[PDB]
């Protein structure tokens with residue numbers, strides 16, 4: 165319990181929520197972050213938190229999930245905030261505006277958010293040039309254990325989804341440590357159908373071919389990001405395809421189109437993906453299942469409702485090598501990053517783990 169954590173949680177964030185609608189608050193958050201207007205993280209990462217996965221060193225396992233920095237404007241500010249890795253996007257091939265406003269809603273009683281942004285994106289070319297301006301800076305960050313992920317989406321009016329993703333691989337693959345084939349946004353019509361076995365195998369074969377065609381030092385890992393709302397059949401199929409094709413990892417999960425019993429927020433019946441605490445254990449269980457179905461051989465980035473060391477460790481023990489958060493930032497602000505890391509370190513020690521690596525999938529070993 166630092167001074168900052170309580171001040172943000174009790175005073176700063178609630179005031180900011182009281183003054184600004186969620187989307188305006190997000191825009192401001194991105195601006196402040198990009199300008200480095202936040203305390204440089206006091207928490208120095210211990211060796212216990214280092215993870216080697218996806219061909220890279222991660223100095224800590226807590227990343228910022230896709231959707232916070234959709235257009236790659238705040239990457240350096242986000243490392244300053246203490247994230248061990250940054251994922252930008254989703255980025256679509258052509259610029260597009262997304263859905264009409266309002267399209268983001270706070271459920272404070274639930275520590276949740278509902279969003280239906282619809283892939284608002286500056287597009288590949290703008291993001292390409294943004295990353296190019298700091299490409300060597302990123303190379304040094306990556307070498308120092310702070311990798312960069314790029315999450316790829318598809319345009320609303322695209323006729324050929326696989327070609328949209330292929331374009332993303334070719335344009336931003338060379339600038340990324342890993343790419344994410346996001347087939348699980350609930351806010352683009354027909355997108356989640358790309359998670360079906362036949363469609364997925366064809367899509368991912370094309371994506372991997374394009375990736376393999378990049379020069380070695382510009383060749384990223386490829387992960388698939390999946391929904392929390394999959395049937396058992398869907399999960400079996402995804403596991404099979406991912407192993408068959410040698411997909412490098414999974415991101416588990418996106419937001420849910422379900423509305424768990426017990427939501428209190430007035431805005432609970434808004435259309436969109438639900439994030440935050442009501443998603444937490446649904447996500448953890450999806451991690452648990454996907455880890456088992458892939459025999460622990462496919463790295464998982466665990467995401468959904470993380471705002472504490474316990475939340476993080478539950479996902480790690482269920483099978484995640486790394487975790488991400490987003491919605492917690494809306495309620496706790498920047499201090500939540502150091503909080504999660506500090507609490508995670510303490511729990512690892514308490515439960516007899518030498519470090520994060522020892523805890524990955526530990527629940528499955530009884």
Ligand SMILES: Cc1cc2nc3c(=O)[nH]c(=O)nc-3n(C[C@H](O)[C@H](O)[C@H](O)COP(=O)(O)O)c2cc1C
Nearest residue numbers: 229230231253254279418439440468469489490491
């Ligand atoms: C406002 C908002 C926008 C998001 N945009 C994206 C996106 O563009 N691409 C994506 O893969 N996930 C997106 N997500 C999903 C998050 O990356 C994450 O998977 C999900 O919110 C669960 O984590 P959380 O409970 O910590 O927020 C978005 C989430 C929110 C709340």
Ligand SMILES: CC(C)[C@H]1CC(=O)c2nnn(-c3cc(F)c(-c4cc(CO)ccc4F)c(F)c3)c2C1
Nearest residue numbers: 181186189190192193196197202270493494497498
């Ligand atoms: C969809 C998400 C993003 C929004 C949902 C929502 O309704 C909301 N309400 N407040 N808030 C928010 C506002 C902020 F200004 C910061 C922030 C503040 C500082 C100043 O030290 C530095 C960096 C930051 F990111 C923050 F982390 C979250 C959000 C985010």
Ligand SMILES: CCCCCCCCCCCC[N+](C)(C)[O-]
Nearest residue numbers: 272273274275424441442443445
């Ligand atoms: C600031 C509000 C705090 C909300 C904290 C919520 C704790 C977990 C309860 C949500 C569980 C949803 N469920 C049933 C799908 O697991």
Ligand SMILES: O=C(O)c1cc(=O)[nH]c(=O)[nH]1
Nearest residue numbers: 281282283349351419437
């Ligand atoms: O842009 C959006 O609406 C969006 C994309 C995604 O992948 N997940 C989410 O919750 N929203």
Ligand SMILES: [Cl-]
Nearest residue numbers: 296299338339
């Ligand atoms: Cl480049």
Ligand SMILES: [Cl-]
Nearest residue numbers: 377378379380
């Ligand atoms: Cl060559």
Ligand SMILES: [Cl-]
Nearest residue numbers: 430431432433
């Ligand atoms: Cl209702």
Ligand code: NA
Nearest residue numbers: 360361398401
């Ligand atoms: Na299927």
Ligand code: NA
Nearest residue numbers: 468469470489
């Ligand atoms: Na999370």
